[PDB]
Each structure stands twice: as structure tokens, then as C-alpha cells.
Amino acid sequence: KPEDFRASTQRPFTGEEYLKSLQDGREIYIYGERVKDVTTHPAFRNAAASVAQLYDALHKPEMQDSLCWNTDTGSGGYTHKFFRVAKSADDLRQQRDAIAEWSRLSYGWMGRTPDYKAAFGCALGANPGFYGQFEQNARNWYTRIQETGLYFNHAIVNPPIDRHLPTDKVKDVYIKLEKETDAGIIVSGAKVVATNSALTHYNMIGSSDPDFALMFVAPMDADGVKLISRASYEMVAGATGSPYDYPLSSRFDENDAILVMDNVLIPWENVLIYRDFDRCRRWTMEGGFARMYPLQACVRLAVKLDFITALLKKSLECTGTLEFRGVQADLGEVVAWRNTFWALSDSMCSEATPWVNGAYLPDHAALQTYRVLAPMAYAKIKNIIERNVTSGLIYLPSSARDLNNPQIDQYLAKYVRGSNGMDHVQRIKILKLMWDAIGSEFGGRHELYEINYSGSQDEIRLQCLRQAQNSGNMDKMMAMVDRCLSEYDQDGWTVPHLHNNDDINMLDKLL
Amino acid sequence: HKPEDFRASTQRPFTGEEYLKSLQDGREIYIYGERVKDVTTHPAFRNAAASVAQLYDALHKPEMQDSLCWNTDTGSGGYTHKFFRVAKSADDLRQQRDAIAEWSRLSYGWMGRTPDYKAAFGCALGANPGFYGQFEQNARNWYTRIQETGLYFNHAIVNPPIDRHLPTDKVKDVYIKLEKETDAGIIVSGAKVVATNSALTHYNMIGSSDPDFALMFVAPMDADGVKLISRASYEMVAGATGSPYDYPLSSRFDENDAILVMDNVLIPWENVLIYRDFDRCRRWTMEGGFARMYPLQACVRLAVKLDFITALLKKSLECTGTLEFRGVQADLGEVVAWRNTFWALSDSMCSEATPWVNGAYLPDHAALQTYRVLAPMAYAKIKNIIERNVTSGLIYLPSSARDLNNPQIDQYLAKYVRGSNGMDHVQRIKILKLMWDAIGSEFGGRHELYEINYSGSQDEIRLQCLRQAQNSGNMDKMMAMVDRCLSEYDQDGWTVPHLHNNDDINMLDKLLK
Numbered sequence A: 001k002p003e004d005f006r007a008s009t010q011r012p013f014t015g016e017e018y019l020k021s022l023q024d025g026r027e028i029y030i031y032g033e034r035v036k037d038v039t040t041h042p043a044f045r046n047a048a049a050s051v052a053q054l055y056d057a058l059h060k061p062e063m064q065d066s067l068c069w070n071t072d073t074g075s076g077g078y079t080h081k082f083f084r085v086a087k088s089a090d091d092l093r094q095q096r097d098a099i100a101e102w103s104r105l106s107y108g109w110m111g112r113t114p115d116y117k118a119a120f121g122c123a124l125g126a127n128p129g130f131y132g133q134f135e136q137n138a139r140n141w142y143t144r145i146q147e148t149g150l151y152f153n154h155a156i157v158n159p160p161i162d163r164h165l166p167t168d169k170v171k172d173v174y175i176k177l178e179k180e181t182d183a184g185i186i187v188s189g190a191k192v193v194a195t196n197s198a199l200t201h202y203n204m205i206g207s208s209d210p211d212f213a214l215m216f217v218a219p220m221d222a223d224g225v226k227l228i229s230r231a232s233y234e235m236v237a238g239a240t241g242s243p244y245d246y247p248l249s250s251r252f253d254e255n256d257a258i259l260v261m262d263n264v265l266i267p268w269e270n271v272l273i274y275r276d277f278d279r280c281r282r283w284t285m286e287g288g289f290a291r292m293y294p295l296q297a298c299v300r301l302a303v304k305l306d307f308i309t310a311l312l313k314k315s316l317e318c319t320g321t322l323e324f325r326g327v328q329a330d331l332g333e334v335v336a337w338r339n340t341f342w343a344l345s346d347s348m349c350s351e352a353t354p355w356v357n358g359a360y361l362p363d364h365a366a367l368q369t370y371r372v373l374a375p376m377a378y379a380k381i382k383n384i385i386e387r388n389v390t391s392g393l394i395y396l397p398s399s400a401r402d403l404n405n406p407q408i409d410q411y412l413a414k415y416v417r418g419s420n421g422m423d424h425v426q427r428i429k430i431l432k433l434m435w436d437a438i439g440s441e442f443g444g445r446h447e448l449y450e451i452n453y454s455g456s457q458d459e460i461r462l463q464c465l466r467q468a469q470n471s472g473n474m475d476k477m478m479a480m481v482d483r484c485l486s487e488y489d490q491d492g493w494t495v496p497h498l499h500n501n502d503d504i505n506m507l508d509k510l511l
Numbered sequence B: 001h002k003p004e005d006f007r008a009s010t011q012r013p014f015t016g017e018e019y020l021k022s023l024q025d026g027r028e029i030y031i032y033g034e035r036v037k038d039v040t041t042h043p044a045f046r047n048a049a050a051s052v053a054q055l056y057d058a059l060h061k062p063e064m065q066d067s068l069c070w071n072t073d074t075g076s077g078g079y080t081h082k083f084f085r086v087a088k089s090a091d092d093l094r095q096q097r098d099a100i101a102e103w104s105r106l107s108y109g110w111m112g113r114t115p116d117y118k119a120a121f122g123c124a125l126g127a128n129p130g131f132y133g134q135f136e137q138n139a140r141n142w143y144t145r146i147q148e149t150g151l152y153f154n155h156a157i158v159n160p161p162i163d164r165h166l167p168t169d170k171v172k173d174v175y176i177k178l179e180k181e182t183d184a185g186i187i188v189s190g191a192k193v194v195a196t197n198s199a200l201t202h203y204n205m206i207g208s209s210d211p212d213f214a215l216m217f218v219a220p221m222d223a224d225g226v227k228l229i230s231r232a233s234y235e236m237v238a239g240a241t242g243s244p245y246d247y248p249l250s251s252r253f254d255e256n257d258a259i260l261v262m263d264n265v266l267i268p269w270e271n272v273l274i275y276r277d278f279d280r281c282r283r284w285t286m287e288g289g290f291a292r293m294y295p296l297q298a299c300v301r302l303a304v305k306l307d308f309i310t311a312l313l314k315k316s317l318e319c320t321g322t323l324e325f326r327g328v329q330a331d332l333g334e335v336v337a338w339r340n341t342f343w344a345l346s347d348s349m350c351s352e353a354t355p356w357v358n359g360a361y362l363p364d365h366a367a368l369q370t371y372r373v374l375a376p377m378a379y380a381k382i383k384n385i386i387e388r389n390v391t392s393g394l395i396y397l398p399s400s401a402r403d404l405n406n407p408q409i410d411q412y413l414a415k416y417v418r419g420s421n422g423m424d425h426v427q428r429i430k431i432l433k434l435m436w437d438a439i440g441s442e443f444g445g446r447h448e449l450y451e452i453n454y455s456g457s458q459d460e461i462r463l464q465c466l467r468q469a470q471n472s473g474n475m476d477k478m479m480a481m482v483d484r485c486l487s488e489y490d491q492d493g494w495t496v497p498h499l500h501n502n503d504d505i506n507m508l509d510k511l512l513k
Ligand SMILES: Nc1ncnc2c1ncn2[C@@H]1O[C@H](COP(=O)(O)O)[C@@H](O)[C@H]1O
Pocket: A455, A456, A457, A458, A459, B326
């Protein structure tokens, strides 16, 4: 039904059609109050507008070569390239570039745009056989996500568990099967971290007692589905700031909601794994999604780092410190980190492997490496920024209102000039953009997001080790060590090309 | 003369035996105050020479040739190591990348200046010979020779220190300079510090007012007046006071970092490439190709070393029993991630390769710069991870294989120094001594210094990375994105229609009136 807002079944949503499709009485709360319409509400309207621009880009002729492919469904339509299964390394490369083009429309700041779960669509379409009796649901959801550009998110972090309560009363917190009916299954529970779910069409929900081993799809307007929002940096920036003062907070805020399911009916067409510990446990390795979505996440980060790199250079242009050797070296390190994530995405595509049914998966080692390095790189870049743009960021007048009151602005024009023949309005503008990138509450949330998602530092490293072991890479490395050890022993070399040291060993003489 | 004349065939590079013979040429090498007679038999160099020789042998093993070798492009009908012939596509670079890896695996990544390193200098000459003006033909001929023979070059390129308390002459004398121009070539004197493994090479490339200093040329190691002053020999010390079991890398992979001295050396004109030419000397790093090519070799070689270190760390932790703990597994996983990083950078070097001149391709340049910035950080971090996880394992190791072969000692070692996974004390001690030689022996300490410094100071590798971003136009593209962002609003609000003005929600008047 959300795709029925389209005037055409041969293309995805336009922006206007996407926005209309959101006016569906989804139950969203923020600041103790219910949200009437996310497309007009002061906490969500600009973020919605920003996603809508992504849908609009799909239909501009000049973009279509880089953003769009024909569908593979027979519809005669087109879609964003990452919404169709890749059948080669070069298909993955073109997808990489289509992701990048979308990400540039938010300067790398929206990390949960529709292309993130496009990979879940593709995973369903590439390996529907994985799902046994629900194979046909996988196929139909692939076709649907691909043709329409439906906006999914995944809500997947479990709610905390009070360990002093009884084991009676603590099952009620996880996503659980309440009841089986002919019209579908009824479920209750919660997932924390439903990033930008207020603006999506559906969410994927996934994980003894098989009543907990579920994976299914749930629409955002289903009765019983509710979002409890976190503070809105968009609304705070609108109420007490301005675009000039909070240029990113005001338009790219992706609210990290708690997703509550109270007694929700999930039709059988939306169920993918059902009371099935075996399939649930095997899905991360065999379902494909975990092996696919980090291509989008690495590219999105790399675009963000494109932005931060030049924003840092521009900030140092208006303080005047860019000329100093030590400042230049710090900027060069930021460049190297930026380059790194582009190169990892190159390797993802160039070393892609055939998977099933002709589908190709990006290089897996590169995905794990991206996950390990991104938190280190981001923390290090932010510290480089803060220790090089020093006071530039601290004293910035409170507000565009200061610039528009000539009684204040007269002093700003004199004492807050840019150091390269640049006027105070532009200097303040640049440095406020840098501040919103790193120090505003939005910037602080983004640091937390870049550091922690994908998981804890231990866990991403463990997953990296396990990929090396499971792929056979570690055993190949070990083969090399074992060969080295093979070539000598406590009596000397075991290979003929090397010289015994008996003729030069002086230990007998010394002792 | 002609070292390649030691080959029984002109249609293939040296065999190991032929290489070793080619080194018995009365090169003037000093170590420990003494002149070296024959690098192939001397206790400081003989095993390192044998290890390089194994590289030449591999080229002729049938089962290796698909990965290691191509036909030459000279018409000779011969073959060569793939990295010795110019690459003319991204896939050629990938095949070269794989051939470099196969060779590096024969020293487990520990020899960093094997012949494939300067093969990139040969290819640079063969790809852009016009660069050299009147010496273009020398470029062409050197390409052919290096390619067909597998000649072992090194570059000596760091200048000697300058006492700034002496007169302005006396400190002029000390850089490589033209002493005399003659019909038979140029006579040159000076020094280059850091001639890594030059004792085992055939030629060295030497390069950079007063145009007498703006030189680039080739010099054989047996030329009269060419001398090496060696550093301490970890090979000789390990042979003299240790054993293969005790110093399994020092004993065979030591690449002596020599000072290269030229006392009045005659360089024939056929060995000159740049002559009294500040313009060409200044432009050669960016335009000559070598700087844009050899990092492919150096990244792969490091990646192979990290393969080795990664599994050796795992094996060490199997010996102590600590591998099972979560925090140890996470540290090992980080080592894996750094290992993965350098393989991925080499993938990107090849896949994003660009057309250059005369049909040649160059590896992606941003990837080369990134490798150079990241390698010192990764290496120091890996070494610290090893030392904080294997720790006690490495400290107390009995002194010698001699302890194991004396049953009066070995009885105690067998009981108290067992491996923690049903592994006997001989294997436990063996693995951990291998790790120690990799990181804590003097060979290990030199390798840490080499991986960190090299390529240049930390500031400089970062500056070159920034400059590559700027000169390539990458930084201006990034900046166009920033300027677009800035163009979409001003001090009065949005300048684009799709976003909502906040005038309807701004509460500041109310708060402040
Ligand atoms: N099973 C576990 N054993 C030890 N530490 C853990 C475990 N699970 C999570 N942690 C740590 O708890 C912190 C938060 O992890 P998380 O809740 O996964 O974000 C991190 O420092 C993790 O390393």
C-alpha cells in the first residue's frame, strides 16, 4: 500500500510521493507527546525532506546513468543500482558508485538511508532458498523493495535485562511470539536503536524456547507498533538555533528511537524465519546481508570523510594555521584515513566472489577491516580537528541574530575576520559547520554512532579474527610459519642451501 | 666482467648458482675493520646471499613459473620475473602483485630489498625513456638488460650528515659530485648512507646551485673506488654465538645497511641518466615513475610479513595457552585487520591503476601514499600487541639449543617449559624464539626501525599524502562538496526550497524579549 502512492509502478517513489506515503498515522512519541505527521512535525520534517531528495534524484535524467539500473523483475521499470542483485565485481563497483552519489546528497551524514537495507532486499532475492517454507516471501519482498524503493530499517538491539527480577517477567521484554493465527503471528517486545525508523515504511526484526527465534517484517503504521523517540537535534536547532548556526543538525538528524511492539499482527507474507534457532543462528554467515551492507556503510563513511577532510582544510584556511608544517602533516593524516576507506571499498568490489544463483558478494576481509578501522580513524580525526582548530571553535557568536543586529555585527566584522582575506560571515559560517560536525549534540551522537555501531571494539575484532579463520586465510598464514619452522631444528638447518654455523660458532672456545 | 655473462643462457635470468658466482668479483666491502674477501663465503653475508639465490632458483621451477614469470617484451624469446617487465593494464599490475608476493614468501616477508624492488626502476626507465633527453638510449638499454637478466639493483639515496660548524667548503665535498668529465665517462666522489643489502647486489643507482651535484647514474659494485662500510652483522653474531634454532631469521635474512663510498669512481657515459641538470633531478620523483611504482612491491612485501607475524602471534599464544581469552583474541583480531589493510591497499593500487605513457600503467597513487602513512603506525601497534600478549613467554627462554642437547639441563626444560597445548618444550621454545627474533633481537629492533622510518619522517609521509590529494584534484573535489553544503543556507535561512524555514518554530523572541 505505501508504494500505491506512486503515480507509476515502473519507478520508485518520487520525493513528494515518499512524503505522502508517510502520512499514515504511525504511532510516534517525542517529548511526551504523540507526533501527528512526521512530514510536518518540527522534530522530523527536514530529515524527511532530506530523504525525499534522495528519491527525487533517481528521476533526474543526468543522474540516472550513475544511480539507476533497469529492474530484473520484468516490470520495464528502473531502480537504484544497489536495490538489484549484483552478478559481477563490476556490478558491485557500479553499486559502490551509486551509493556514493546518494551519500553525497547528505554530505555523508545520513547513515541509515534507504540503500542501507537495499542490501537486505538483495540478500532475500539472491538466496531465497535459505528460508525453506518462506522462500516465496523472500522473493516477493525482493521484488517489492527493488521496484518501489521501499525504505526499510533494521531494529536489532535487544532491551536490557534486570537480572534481579524473577526469570518470571523477563521474557516479556524480548521480541516474542504471543500467538499463531491463520491471519499471521502476533508479537510483542522491543528493539532499541531504530535509527531513523520514524521515516521508514517497514522495519526488519530479528534475534531455548523457539518462540524467540523469529525474523519478520513489520510496517511502521501497523497497530501496536510504536516509536519512543530520543531528543531531536533537528527540533532543538529549529527552536533555539538556525540553519546558519546548526547546518547539519537542522536537516540530517536520524532519530535513534526505541521500537515497541505491543500486540502486533504480522501477516504470514511478512514472516521470514519462524521458531527456527538453526536458521536464525546461520543467517549472519549464510543470509548474505551481513556480507553485503558494509559496502554501503564503508562508502557512506568515506563520503563523510571526504566532507570532513575538506572542511578541516577550510577551517584551517580561515584561522591561518594551514601553512604550518605540523598542521599540514595532521591534515595529511586525515587524508590518509579518508583514502583508506575508499581503498577498502575498491577491494570489496575487485575481489568480489561468486555466491549463489549468480550473485556476487564483496570481499569479506575488507568488510571486517572497515569495521575495525572506522572507530579508530573517526576518533583520531576528531581529535586532530579539535587540537588544530583550537579557539576557532569556542567563541563563535551565539547566533545569526548577532550578525543581523548591526550593534553587535559592527564588532564581529572587525574582530572575527577570516585570516585569508575572508569576511566574518563566511569565517563564522565555516567554523559553525565544523562545530556542528563534531561538537554539537548531533556531532557527539555521530561520534558515538561511528565508534559503536557494528558493535563493541572487542567484538568487531573477534569477528575479524573469525573471518580470517573461517575463510582459511589463517591456516594459509600458519602454513607459511610451519614451513619456516620446518627448515631448521635444534641441530641446525634441515635444508641444504644454507651454511651450518659449526665452522664459525665460538661458544666452545668461550666456555 | 658483465655479471649476467655468468648465465649459461641469455633467455632467462640467473639461476641461484649463477648469481652467487656473479658476486665473486672483488667488490670492496669492509666490516669489523676488515676487508671482505668473498660475500658468498664470508660469515656476515653467506646465508643472506644463499637466501637471495633461492629467489633466482624459483624462477626456473616449472610449478612456479605461472605465478612468477612472463615472457620478456624485448623479442629475445626469454622469460623474466613479471615485475621486471612494464605493466600495460590493471590486470598486469595484479599479476605483478602476485609474483612479488610469491617471491616475498620465500623470506617470509623479512627481506625488503630483494631484486624485485628495483625492478621497478628498470620498468620506469623502459616506460618513460624520453624523460632523460640525451640519455634516453641509456634508459632503454638499462631496461632491456635489467629485464632479461634479473640484475640485482639497489638505490643508495640518503645524503651524508653535514657539520654546520665547518667552512662552506669541506661540507661541499661530501655529497656525490662530479669530479671530472672525460671522454670515457665521469669521475665522481661522495657517499650515500643506507645502502641496504648492497653487499649482495650488482649495481646501485645513485641520485639526488652548482650543477656538479645534480646527477643520477648507475655504478657496479665491483667498480674501483666503490666501497661498502658495513654495519654490525646479525647473521655473523647469530652464527658465532647462537644457532639457527636460537636466531632463525637473523641467521639467514639479514640485509646489511651499509654506507656506500665512492672514491674517484669512473662512471661510463652509458651508465649516466641525468647529468648536471637540476630541472630533471627535481622533476624525477613525480615524473620518472619509480616513486609511483616501487610502493606496490613494498606494500606487498609488508603484507606478506604481516601474514607471517599474524600466524606466528597465534602460534605463540597457543604455546602460552592464552589464545582462548577474549581480550587476547581481540588483540589478535586487530593484528589480522592491519594485515588485511595492506592486502586491500595493494588490491586498490592495481584495480584503480591509471594509463601513464607509452601504454604503461601506474598503480593508484592515493593507495601508495596511504600505505606509506599507515605502515609505521600499524607496525608499531602490532609489535606492542605482541609484547603485551606473549610477554613472559619471550623473556626467559633458555639461552641455546645447547641447553636442549645437554640432558643435565634438558631434563628440567622438558618438565618446566612445556607448551600449554600438549606441545613439547622443544617446539614451544622454538616458536617463541622465532617470535623473539622477529621483534626483540637486534635484527628485530632494526626491522622495527626500518618499517617505521624509511619512506621518510612521519611529517614528510603525511605531507606527501596531502600533496597527492591536492595535485591530483582530489582535495578540490572534496572541497566542491563542502562549498555546495555552504551554498545551501546563509545568515537568513535556507537558500534551497525543499527545507522548512524555522521562523514558525523559532522560540528565541519569546525567550528574550
Ligand atoms: N561476553 C562478554 N564478555 C566480556 N565482555 C563483554 C561481553 N559482552 C560485552 N562485553 C563488553 O561490554 C562492553 C559493552 O558491550 P556491548 O554491550 O556489546 O556494546 C564492551 O566493553 C564489551 O567488550
